[PDB]
């Protein structure tokens, strides 16, 4: 086509979803992490994993205002990668880098698993 | 603004 | 703080929420513009338009899952905004720069009011 | 992946 493209559009977006989920605005779902609850964007966390985008387009769980995710999921490596998708920064540490490698394997988000297989790399 |  | 950046994130997440909308995947709202319906998510048309984050913050309207636009609002002009929120894309034309600013005008998005603006000026 |  002939359109014109505003290059800031998308991180202007995400910028305004994540003010969106931290004044707790129509967010739709609590994913529980055992003893924690992250409250979220069904849409946000299909767009941004795997594991997610095949729960929310199950015609039974789409409608769960309520996930629990294996007891194995360390909360910490949860929360990071949840701010991770609503923010295009990851907060990667060397004490908490295998928590959220595990994590990102868990959810299925094949960039952080990347990113994250590459700093240990680079530690051996 | 940008031609894509 | 010492985070990394995945620089295409928000492109990925924009490209993937633009899918659910092409696959009617979890939409929760039907825009209506005289005769014709636009089904979106409310948090995507939200983190583009101020008429949409003023509405879906209200008590009430946050609710309703059909929103009537002015009769004067162009649904051709309303379409490719639409295309645009969920694309970063803007088709602008000759033949549709006037009912497209008046639209982005109306929903309050701002950066659209403005290359509307500058293509006008370029032709006068 | 950069230092932003
Ligand atoms: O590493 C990843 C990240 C990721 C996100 C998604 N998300 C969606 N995929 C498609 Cl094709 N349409 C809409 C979506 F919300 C699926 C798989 C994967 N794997
Ligand atoms: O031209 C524009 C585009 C636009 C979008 C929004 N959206 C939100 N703003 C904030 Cl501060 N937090 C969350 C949001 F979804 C508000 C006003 C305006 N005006
Ligand atoms: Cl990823
Ligand atoms: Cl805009």
Not at chain 1, 4 to 15: E, G, K, M, N, P
Not at chain 1, 40 to 55: D, E, N, R
Not at chain 1, 101 to 115: F, I, K, P, R, S
């Amino acid at each position: 086509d002939s359109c014109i493209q505003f290059t800031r559009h998308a991180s202007d977006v995400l910028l305004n979803l994540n003010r969106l989920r931290s004044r707790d605005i129509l967010t739709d779902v609590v994913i529980v992490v055992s003893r924690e609850q992250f409250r979220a964007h069904k849409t946000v966390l299909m767009a941004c994993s795997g594991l997610f985008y095949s729960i929310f387009t199950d015609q039974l769980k789409c409608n769960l205002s309520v996930i629990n995710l294996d007891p194995e999921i360390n909360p910490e490596g949860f929360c990071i990668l949840l701010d991770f998708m609503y923010t295009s920064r990851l907060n990667l540490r060397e004490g908490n880098i295998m928590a959220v490698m595990a994590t990102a394997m868990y959810l299925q988000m094949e960039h952080v698993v990347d990113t994250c297989r590459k700093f240990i790399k680079a530690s051996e | 603004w940008v031609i894509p």
